[model samples]
Target: MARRGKKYIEASKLVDRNKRYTLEEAVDLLKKMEEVLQRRFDETVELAMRLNVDPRYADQMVRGSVVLPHGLGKPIKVVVFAEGEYAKKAEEAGADYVGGDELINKILKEEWTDFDVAIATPEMMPKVAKLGRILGPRGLMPSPKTGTVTTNVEQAIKDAKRGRVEFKVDKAGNVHMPVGKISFEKEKLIDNLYAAIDAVVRAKPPGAKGQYIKNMAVSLTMSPSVKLDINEVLKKLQEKAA
Candidate 1:
């Protein structure tokens, strides 16, 4: 268990249990837990991170694809290297810039590192390879995970520029990011949280069967981990618009 801080306790009291929190008792109890959460108590409360675990407490990983519903918070700069039929699609999709042989030659010439993402059809991989030294260390190496390494150049470009985000578990076995700051209205944060969770849950690999998502929790940055009822959160999200 983590200790709480005074600010957290104060924030807890500010929570209108009858309003934002549906559970009166839980809200009241949380007030006490707030002491622990706020650092008033002896326990140390590290940043509370939410995670989805398997029933067995063992880790399950899935590698596939989904269009991020909320989009990654950052602008994705995309570069497509293709020619003939595919180059046209890249241009149509509003890729930052697209070129067949010339783009590859330009990269080889100037050694520019301006783009955040790079995509190439399988046929163009050899050409993109020339710029590996420039892109590799920066994690700009396009892969299927980002849909940047695909035969579908146009679709890939569209998705990349859209709300494509990545989620991965860390060494501590937590998979989470701040959907929104706690300062934002709970409803906004909740919507972002729901979209994030849905993307992760839907990415579950088939190798895992029943009880794939054993548990989930949400917490404010620098606050206590509050375990949310998954069903309840889902219901709330369904009622809201993006």
Candidate 2:
């Protein structure tokens, strides 16, 4: 049996296992459990969505980035691959590490990867491509779709530092992402959550058939999952657009 704390046990009882909640209701419940859920240091608030798409097909791939209205409540370390003027621009934009061959050599030789997000200039992709075997598995590889591979290294570095998140559908047809920390204001968390959901909806691949979004859930680092009413959430989103 899994061991749960007194607070966890209590919070678990408050949720009806068979009931799916609307986005607003779910967010309210999450806010109520803030004290209990935040038992860990800076507990991350995560959103997981199941989509009706086959990742095996290129046309059905859902992959993109979004800038949350309220930035993720965590520091993001950024590394940049550039040379000369671009390197200086990246450094000025607050990249933790910026270089061309030196950084590549470090990663290849010493396996140095002490950053959260990696960015590379278009010109430097030839060299950066070598790190794909290492960074790809970790989801830290620079991709044009995620705006991590571009000639505008300065803006990419700044965006990464400012909580630009990249997400892609997994083989299981699930997209999981961190929205914010439990310590964030409830409204901020809700805003970030909506922003992420909207991004996912926008990234619906043309090949997706039937229901694009099958289901979605939200949870804190150590909290029980809360199912969301996808129809209601999408209705609210549509109303906002109108």
Candidate 3:
């Protein structure tokens, strides 16, 4: 659970943990993270190493959101857990699957599996406890980490449908994701990266404080991470609100 009050201090401490890298250094880091994440792309890997950006800002300590203009290569399937009304509405909204008591029964009976994302309405959490065995290992257990469990059911469902992804601080505090595949145009990837970063920034827990977003980077599946210019992104976000 997110700790409240003075949480920003913890968030700040966490953000400060990852060493921000220069573009060159970022490229190298992207490659390292990619190898670790096991992304598939050879050409994109090479291109990342070769591209050059303004030296001054290239290595600026970038911490904040990343939006992927093109998004990751796959479309995620989202499952929503709700009671009578919400369950019906979620299904009507095009959720890959919707459930209530019967859904729980199916899960207990081993009737279904193989979902990418799972979410439950707040009321359903207690009941969800029973399916931990089937969902936990798959990382499909609807938890706040993935925005599956929340009071804002409708919006959460909408975001999930629109390709919203949550990338929280890892055990090491660095957040990274593939914004696009090697085949995508750079502009598309940039857009996807921006969207992703925006989500990360907005997802900040109330318990977090003091630079909740300390450092952020983007990488291809096989490329090194790159520190992006986040100021412009934030400006755009501000404009979006206005």
Candidate 4:
């Protein structure tokens, strides 16, 4: 069995292991966990949703991007592949790194990867393609589906710097991404969670059958997971808007 501390034990008691919680309830419980868990560093709050789609088929792939309402409360390092005017725009937009063949050469030789997000203009894809062997497995490959491959390098850089996160279903049909940090306000975290959930719902593959979202849960780094009642949460969210 894994070792449990006093705070972990107490936090675990607050959640009914047998019951799934609504989004609001889950957020409140997460706040409670944040208050109890003793950690020296700020812990990231992550959201994971299980979907009923097979990514093996291109038509059934669930992949897209979303800009969280309050941002992820963290700085995102963005690197762009562009030259001339586009390069200048990327730099002006605060891209961490900007270049073309030189950038690719750096990655090939020095294996340089001191950035979080990667972006490239359409014309640069042919050059960026060579790095696929390296960036693909790291989930850093630029793809049109994630808005990382675009002609508007400036806007893409700005979006990435402003918390545009890309998510895709894994082999097991689970999508996992960081919503925010434990240090964030409860309301901010909730808003971010809702934004992510809304994006996932909107990106549902038409080829998917039956229930699109199978299950969802929220958790803080090094903390216990809190299950979410997906359908009830969606209903409550809709009613609140209505």
Candidate 5:
């Protein structure tokens, strides 16, 4: 194994690996963890949920998008692959870069993928599909189920700017996405975290049998992840009833 850094080692020492922490409790620890890191830049908070469904089956596929209330704590740069009037609507909707063959050519040559979300019209997908080799591994590829691949130009751009997170269950049944930044207020982070969990629960597949969610966790960009109290969290979710 590679040698671990003293800072990370010290931070890891602060975590209780066997304990399942509450959302509220984790934020308290996270605040202290951020101080311990002593890093200059703000770190992102990411949530990972492990569900009970197997994605190998078509009926059990878990895929969808959720707009986080607090956004991603940064400006979202949305790139739209469109042509003619659709491109006009995309730019009007405040999309950062709007192009068809020109945009495709940039990515194809320089592999310029500096944007956040990639939105493509259904008509543009035939040509955009060719860029999968570049965007696939980076998780920037547009998918129909995620609403990033759609004909509705304006709505897609709006959603991207509003911190819409697209999620699809991985082979290991885990779905992961950013909740917020470490510098966020405690209440804000908690609200974002709850919103993320609720979205995942709503995205539960129809074919999901028995336990739909096995476990969930949240962590800072460079800190050890902590488990959440699934029962308590879901109980509160039911109380909201929306």
Candidate 6:
């Protein structure tokens, strides 16, 4: 229930935890956290925004997927649940893993969810429904709304192969997105950060507040979180809108 020692405390001190950092500053601190922690494992950087809209309401369900500019700093593993001509398309498109009921039951029976992204044909969606119980928690569920469920398995697999990532406001009106890993060039991470921010703003719900976000932060997978200046991010959002 408590923060870990050494690593956590050392990283935490680098951030004030009281002031909001500018977008670039946030990224720098995150990189610094990685250095200070001195851990060998590369850490994923997650951008978490606390929006002013509640997903509990129908109009406040804000969600969208965007292929980040720098990708996830690694190859994205893809899995396809398909059959018939669809399976042929998925395989030809270079999906890392492809199967029908076997993969479906393999996931449901054993809860195997190692793939980074899962795509399924509409014909195979219902079969996917049974596996949703486990996949949903892992963000691996294939859904049509996000283009993971499509008849054109080939096109969808290509899109997933291009390093697409999804963001959706949770029940508490917050969206957490993994932009990249600390090992990435800071320039690429900044571009990816803005990409996620723009996607969330573009998918803004009807009930969103005038400012859209209440607070925001960025942090490595294991390091202490660094606050982000909402206005700084919002300024970029507005300029793009303008």
Cα displacement (Å) at residue 167, model 1: 8.6
Worst 10 residues of 2 by lDDT: 34-43
Quote the lDDT for 147 in model 3: 50
| Runs with alpha carbons beyond 4 Å of true place in candidate 3 | 1-19, 22-67, 72-76, 101-113, 130-139, 165-191, 198-212, 215-242
Full-model lDDT for every candidate: 0.55, 0.81, 0.53, 0.82, 0.82, 0.80
lDDT winner between candidates 4 and 6:
4
Prediction 5 TM-score vs. true: 0.71
Kindly indicate the candidate among 4 and 6 with the higher TM-score: 6
Steric clash count of candidate 4: 0
Point to the candidate with the largest TM-score: 5
lDDT of 2 by residue, 144-213 (tens): 6466878788777777887877777878898887787677788888888889999999999889999999
Candidate 3 residue 191 C-alpha distance from true site, Å: 5.5
43-116, model 4: which lDDT tens digit per residue?
Answer: 66778999999999987899878888875435888889998888988898898989999999998788877667
Whose TM-score is higher: candidate 3's or candidate 6's?
Answer: 6
Question: What's the alpha carbon RMSD for model 6?
Answer: 5.4
Task: Give the Å shift of residue 132 in candidate 1.
Answer: 1.6
Candidate 2: lDDT of 69?
A: 86
- 185: Cα error in model 2, Å: 1.5
Give candidate 4 misplaced runs (Cα > 4 Å): 1-4, 72-158, 240-242
Q: Please write out the lDDT profile of model 6 over residues 1-242, one tens digit for every residue.
A: 23246777988888885988877888888888877776555566878888888788888888788888886534778999899988888889999999999988887888677777899888888888998677664556776545677788887788788777756676787788778778899999999998888888788888776778787888776678888877777886688678
Backbone collision count in every prediction? 14, 0, 24, 0, 0, 0
Write one digit per residue (lDDT tens) for candidate 1, span 176-199: 433433333334444555566666
Worst 10 residues of 4 by lDDT: 137-146
lDDT of 3 by residue, 116-138 (tens): 56779889999999988766634
lDDT (0-100) at residue 152 of candidate 2? 83
Residue 117 miss distance in model 6 (angstroms)? 4.8
